[PDB]
Design a protein around this ligand. Structure first.
Ligand SMILES: O=C(O)c1ccc(O)c(F)c1
Ligand SMILES: O=C(O)c1ccc(O)c(F)c1
Ligand SMILES: O=C(O)c1ccc(O)c(F)c1
Ligand SMILES: O=C(O)c1ccc(O)c(F)c1
Ligand SMILES: O=C(O)c1ccc(O)c(F)c1
Ligand SMILES: O=C(O)c1ccc(O)c(F)c1
Ligand SMILES: O=C(O)c1ccc(O)c(F)c1
Ligand SMILES: [Fe+3]
Ligand SMILES: [Fe+3]
Ligand SMILES: [Fe+3]
Ligand SMILES: [Fe+3]
Lengths: 200, 233, 233, 200, 200, 233, 200
C-alpha cells in the first residue's frame, strides 16, 4: 500500500501546560494578545451565554489541570477563522479548570446550525478538545444544548452513537447564572456516564 | 467564513501513544474505557482558526529576551511544519513552553528545589513563514524529577503545540534532545509503542544553523495530518 | 621520607593522544619536535606527594555549596580510582574544575557571552577513601565555543586532575557525558586516536546513585598506571 | 600477551587550569589550604634559592597559561611526601606563568643528591611536569644547576641523553635577585634549543 | 547508563504459603520457635491493642489464603530489629487469614512516632506487606489509626496521596473486642475503595 | 553594492584535502606550518563578484569551435551547481581547462612529447542558467606523466573553477572520469583522505544527454557551501 | 546531527592554471573580455595605487606559478559586485606571478573602511586568495597598509591574531614606483615569517 510521512506523535500536555497556553492561570504575566475564553464581545449578534463545567477522572475526582480548546460557528452558523481580538466574535477560544474550584468557563454565543458534508443539518454544537497531564493524545467531544431537543433528535452526528444513553452524555444542561443564560457541561473521562469521545 | 474543502488523512492511533499506558500512572484514571466513536469529517472538523492577524510581540519567540540573560546553554530551536504529503504549512501557530536550565518550571505548582532563573520565563510562540519555517531562541532545559515511579526523571524536553489548518490537525507533543540517555527510560516517551515513532520526537543537533561563538542549534521538523481535496463525495 | 619500592607499568603513548594533533591548532606550536628521552625509573620518579594531611574544607567537593544555589542540572559525579591491576588507589587527590550551566568559566580570560552564575565557582577537590572512591556534587556544565576552527564547540566536560601514588601516575584529563553529540566532533577529543580510548572518558548516567526528586548522578572510574613491586633488579 | 586495564587517557589541562589548580591566578578567592610555589619556609635547612623562568612555544612566543608541578628532595637528598602546610619543607609544589610577564617562580631549597635504582648518585635536580592548553599530555623535564658541573658530568640520567649539546638545555643558570641566589630555567617546547623531555 | 545485577524476580506465594510461613495454618506441627502474630508480651510498654481485618478481591470476595507481614516501631517510636521470642516486644510479625471467617489478627501495641528522612514526623503507622496466590509481587501498604486524626493530617507520607478520599483507605477504625481496644483494617485489593498500595 | 545578508556553512577541512600530503611532492614546501586563523564572516567574506554582465563569446563554452575539428572523443560535460542545502546557484561562473586527447597542454611550460592539436585550445567558461546548469562541449583529455614519483600519471581530468555567490564559496577542483583505473593511483587524488569525497569528483557517463551518432556525455554536479540567512545575530 | 550534502572537494589548480584563468600568462590568445589585474581605470575615484609582491615556498624559493584573486571595497568602503569592464572600478581582480621575475602586480585604488558584522570598522584591506600547484586548497589572507597604522591598531580581524609579531606579516610596505604610490606584499607560505592565512 502507499504510506505517507508519519504524523508527529502526540504527547501529554503535562501539568504545566498553563505556562504555555494559559498565562493568567500559570500565574504569569500575559502578553499583549492572548487567546482566551471570551469568544463574543457584548455587541456580538446572537444569544450570548455562559458555558461552564468540571472534568472528572475515572475515580470521580476533579481534573484541576485540564486545558480545553473550543471551535464553533457564530450565530449565523458560520465559522470565523480569521482570529482577531478586534473581532466582535471569534469561532475559536481556550479555557482551563481552576486549581481550586476546578471549573472552566467560556463566554460566547449559541452557534447557528451548519450542515454535514452530505448537506444534512447538524444540531447546534461546540467542538471541544481536552488536554491534560495523563492524556497522551487529546480527547475530542462536542457540546449540544438541552433546549435543542428537536434538532438533537435529528443530528446526523449524534445519531452515529449506537446507544442512545451515551448520546445524553453530550447534552449541556441549561441553567441561569446571575440571571444570565448558562449551560453546564461536565466531562467524565472514564467510568459511569463516560462522555462520548470522537475520532475523525 | 471558512469552507469545507479539504479532507484529512485518518490518524493512525497505533502510531500515536494509546490512552492507557499504565507505566505513566496518571493515564490510568484519565483514559476512556469506551471506544472512541468515529465520525465523518464535516466543516466542524476540517476548519480551524488562522492566527495570521494575531498581534505578536517582537520577542515572542525569543526566550532569551522575552521575560539580564538567562543562565544555561544558548540554542536555536528551528525547523519546518509539513503535512503527510510533504506540503509546508505556512502561517501556522507554534507555541512552546519548557523548564529552565535546572529543570525548574515557572509555575505555582512546580515545587522542585532547583531555583528559578530571574531572567527566564519559558514561553514562546511563532507563526511559521510561507515555507512552513519556525524558530525559537532559548536555553536547553534540564531534566526534572516527577512523582511517577520512585526515581522517574523526564528527559530534557520542550513542550510544543501546533495549530495547523484545522482542528483535525491541532497537535500537542514534546521535543527531546539527541543522545539524551534518559529518553529510553521515560514512561511518557514509552507511551509511544513504536521506536520509530519515538525517533520523530528527537531534535537533531544542527551545527549548520549555529551562531559561532554564540549558540548551538537543534532542528525539529513537524509533520501534521496530510490534507487532500474531497473527491467523488 | 619516601622509598623506591615500586615500579609503574610503562605508559602506552599510542593510547594517550600524541603531542602533535594538528586539528587542535594550539598543539602545533606546543609540541616537541624531538623524541622524548626514556629513562629508568628511580626514586625521583616513583614517589610523589601524599595529601592525607591537607586540611580540606567541609564543602571542598560540593560545588553547590562552595562558592543561594547555582542554576543548572544538579548532579553527583562519583567513581573510583584504580591502578591497571584493578587495585584501588586510596587517599589520592582528585581535583576538578568546570564551567557553569551556560558554558561560562569563572576566569578573567573567559570572554564568552554566556553570563556567570552568582552562586557558582566551579572548583572541587576530594581525597579518595580507603576503597579509591570519590564524589563531587555540582551542576552539569554547558558546552562552549572556542577559537579553533570557525565553529568549534567543546562538548560539556569537567576537567580532572589525579595525583596517584607518584609523579609517574599523575594525570590530567577531561570527563565527557554519555550520549553528547558534540563528542565525535571535538578536535581535543579526537587528539585520542583509539575510539576505545575515547570511551574511557565518557561518564555514564548512574540512576542507581541518584537522589530521587533531587539530583541525577554520573559514574566515572579512573585507571592510573599499574603499580607493582620491583623484582630481580 | 597479557593486557591490563588501559590507563585513562590524558587530555589538555586547557586555558582555565588556573581555576582548579592556581586559584589566585584565576583571580578567584582561594581556600584555607592551597598547594603553591613556596616549598620551603625561611627557617628550612639547606641553601634557599629562588627559581624562575619562561616557557616558549615553537615560534619563540611566551606561553602565558602554563602550569607546572615540581618534585624535589630536601637538602639531605630526602623526598618528603607527607605534604603539610605546617612543614618547613615540602618536596612538592605548584607554579604557573604570569599572564602579563609570562614568568613563573618557585621558593625552595637546593636539593641534596639521590641515588638511582643502581645505587649511582644523580646530580641535584628538580623534577618538573608542564601542563598547558595545546599540551595533550604533560611534558616531563628535570632542572639541574650550572654550579654543580662536577656532579652533572657524572649523572646517570644526564648521561642517557645522546647529544651533549641537548644536556645543556637542562641546566639552570645561576644569578642573583635582591641579593638572593636565583636560578633561571627557561623551557623551549619546540625548535632551536628545544628542552629535553623525558618518558618513564 | 550503569547497570547492576538485576534483582531476582518475584513470584506469587501460591495457595500453600502456609506450609512454609504459617505452620499452624497449614494444619502442620510447628517448630520450637515460630514468627507469628504476637508482637507484644503482656508486660510490654505502650497501649496494647488488637488489630483485625479481612482481605477483599476485586469482586468483593474474601481472599482466604492471604499472608501478611508487619513492621512497626515500639511505643517509643523505636524499631526493634533484633528478633527474639524472649523480647517483650518485637517490631516484626506475621499473620494470615482464616480459611473459614477469613480474618487475620495481630496482638501488639500502638507504635510511637518516627521521623522521615527529612526530619518530619510521621503519624503512628504499621507497615504491611500482603502476599497470596494471584499476587505476583507483594503489595505494600500502611495502617494508620482513626484516633490520630491530628497526626494523620500532617503525615508527610499520607500527604503524598493526591486524592484525600484515597487516604481514608489507610485509616483503621477503632472498636473494642472483649473490652480490648481494637482497630479494624480491611484491605480492598481492587475496585470501589481500593486500598492505596505503595512503591518504595 | 554588495550586502552582508548571508552566512556560509563552515568548510569541513577534513573533507577537503589537507595542505600537507607528502606523496604529492610539491605540497611539502607549499603548505603552511602554522594553523589557519579562524575569523568571523563579515561583508568582506560573504560577498563576491557577479559575472552576469561579463561579455561571453558565442563559443566560450564550446572547445570544439573556440580555438578544423580537434581529434579526440567528442563529449559534452554538463551538470548543475548547487549549495549544500540543494539550492541552485544561478548565474555563476564556471571556468575549465584541460589537455588535449594526447594529454598535451597548450602552455609554454608543457614539455610532454605528446603533440599539440592544431584545432584545440583547452579553455572554456559558462555562466550557469536560472536553474544552476552549465554545459561544455570538448574532447576527453588524455592522462599524462608528471615529475612526482618516477612513474606517476594523472588520470584524464578537467580542471574546473566555480565562483558561486561569494569569495567564501569560490572553488578550484578537477573532474575525473568514471572507471579510470588511474584514479586510485594518483597522489593528487589521494590528497583527499575520504574515499567518499573522491566519488564526488567522478563524472558519470550520461547516455541520456548524448547526441546519437555525434557525442557522448558526462554529468558533473558541483556542491558549493550552503548559504543561509543570518539569524539572531 | 543534521548533515547537508558535502561540498565538492578542492583540488590544486596545477601548474597550467594560466591557460584557464590568465590567458596572456599562458602565452595564449585571449578572449574579448577577460578578468585581469586592473581593478580601476584612471578616471576612478580614490587614491590610485600599484600593488606588487612575490610568493615564497618553505625553502625561501620563488613560487613562479602562483595565481591570485583579489576582492576589495571601492574608495567609499563599498563592494562593487556587478563585474563589468565598462565600470570605472571593479572590486574583483586576478593576477599571477611572472615565470621570470616571479612577481605579480595589481592596479587599483585604496579601499575605504568597512565594518564587521558587529558594526566595528576594519582597517582598509584587500582580500586575497592564493592558488598554485602544490596547494590543495586555496590559501586566504588579507593585505593591510603600513600607512594606516592608526586603523590597523584597532582592526577587529587583525586583533584576532594572537601573536602581535604575526600581524606584521599582513602589512604591505609603502613605496613608490615611477613616482607612483606602491605597496609591496610578499607572501611566505611556510617557515620564517610565514604569512598568516585565514579560515572563514
Ligand atoms: O506528571 C506528569 O504527568 C508530567 C510531568 C512533567 C512533564 O513534563 C510532563 F509532560 C508530564
Ligand atoms: O487500550 C486498552 O488497553 C483498553 C481500551 C479500552 C478498554 O475498555 C480496555 F479495558 C482496555
Ligand atoms: O608525532 C609526529 O607526528 C612527529 C613527531 C616529531 C617530529 O619531529 C615530527 F616531524 C612529527
Ligand atoms: O583553547 C583551548 O585549548 C581549550 C579551550 C577550552 C577547553 O576546555 C580546553 F580543554 C582547551
Ligand atoms: O493456584 C495458584 O495460583 C498456584 C498453585 C500452585 C503454585 O505453586 C502457585 F505458585 C500458584
Ligand atoms: O597537517 C599536518 O600534518 C601538519 C600541519 C601543520 C604542521 O606544522 C605540521 F607539522 C603538520
Ligand atoms: O605538477 C603538478 O603539481 C601537477 C601536474 C598536472 C596536474 O594536472 C596537476 F593538477 C598538478
Ligand atoms: Fe514538562
Ligand atoms: Fe574546558
Ligand atoms: Fe507451589
Ligand atoms: Fe592537469
Amino acid at each position: 500500500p502507499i504510506e505517507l510521512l508519519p504524523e508527529t506523535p502526540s504527547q501529554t500536555a503535562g501539568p504545566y501546560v498553563h505556562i504555555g497556553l494559559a498565562l493568567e492561570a500559570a500565574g504569569n504575566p500575559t502578553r499583549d494578545q492572548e487567546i482566551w475564553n471570551r469568544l463574543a464581545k457584548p455587541d456580538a449578534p446572537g444569544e450570548h451565554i455562559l458555558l461552564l463545567g468540571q472534568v472528572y477522572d475515572g475515580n470521580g475526582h476533579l481534573v484541576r489541570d485540564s486545558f480545553l480548546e473550543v471551535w464553533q460557528a457564530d450565530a449565523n452558523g458560520e465559522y470565523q477563522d480569521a482570529y482577531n481580538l478586534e473581532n466582535a466574535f471569534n469561532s475559536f477560544g481556550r479555557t482551563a479548570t481552576t486549581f481550586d474550584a476546578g471549573e472552566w468557563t467560556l463566554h460566547t454565543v449559541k452557534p447557528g446550525v451548519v450542515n454535514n458534508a452530505a448537506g444534512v443539518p447538524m444540531a447546534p454544537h461546540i467542538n471541544i478538545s481536552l488536554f491534560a497531564r495523563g492524556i497522551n493524545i487529546h480527547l475530542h467531544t462536542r457540546l449540544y444544548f438541552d433546549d435543542e431537543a428537536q434538532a438533537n433528535a435529528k443530528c446526523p452526528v449524534l445519531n452515529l452513537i449506537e446507544q442512545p444513553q451515551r448520546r445524553e452524555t453530550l447534552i449541556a444542561k441549561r441553567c441561569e447564572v446571575d440571571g444570565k443564560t448558562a449551560y453546564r457541561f461536565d466531562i467524565r473521562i472514564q467510568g459511569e456516564g463516560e462522555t462520548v469521545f470522537f475520532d475523525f | 467564513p471558512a469552507q469545507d474543502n479539504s479532507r484529512f488523512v485518518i490518524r493512525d492511533r497505533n502510531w500515536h501513544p494509546k490512552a492507557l499506558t499504565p507505566d505513566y500512572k496518571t493515564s490510568i484514571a484519565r483514559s476512556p474505557r469506551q471506544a472512541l466513536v468515529s465520525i465523518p469529517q464535516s466543516i466542524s472538523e476540517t476548519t480551524g482558526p488562522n492566527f495570521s492577524h494575531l498581534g505578536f510581540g517582537a520577542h515572542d519567540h525569543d526566550l532569551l529576551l522575552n521575560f539580564g540573560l538567562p543562565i544555561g546553554e544558548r540554542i536555536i530551536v528551528a525547523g519546518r511544519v509539513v503535512d503527510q504529503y510533504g506540503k509546508p504549512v505556512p502561517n501556522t501557530l507554534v507555541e512552546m513552553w519548557q523548564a529552565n536550565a535546572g529543570g525548574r518550571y515557572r509555575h505555582k505548582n512546580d515545587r522542585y528545589l532547583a531555583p528559578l532563573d530571574p531572567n527566564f520565563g519559558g514561553v514562546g510562540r511563532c507563526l511559521t513563514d510561507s515555507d512552513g519555517y519556525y524558530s525559537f531562541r532559548t536555553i536547553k532545559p534540564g531534566p526534572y524529577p516527577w512523582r511517577n515511579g520512585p526515581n522517574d526523571w523526564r528527559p530534557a524536553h520542550i513542550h510544543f503545540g501546533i495549530s495547523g489548518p484545522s482542528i483535525a490537525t491541532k497537535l500537542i507533543t514534546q521535543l527531546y534532545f539527541e543522545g539524551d540517555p534518559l529518553i529510553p527510560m521515560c514512561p511518557i516517551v514509552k507511551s509511544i509503542a513504536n521506536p520509530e515513532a519515538v525517533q520523530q520526537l528527537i531534535a537533531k543537533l544542527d551545527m549548520n544553523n549555529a551562531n559561532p561563538m554564540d549558540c548551538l542549534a537543534y532542528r525539529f521538523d513537524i509533520v501534521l495530518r496530510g490534507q487532500r481535496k474531497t473527491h467523488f463525495e
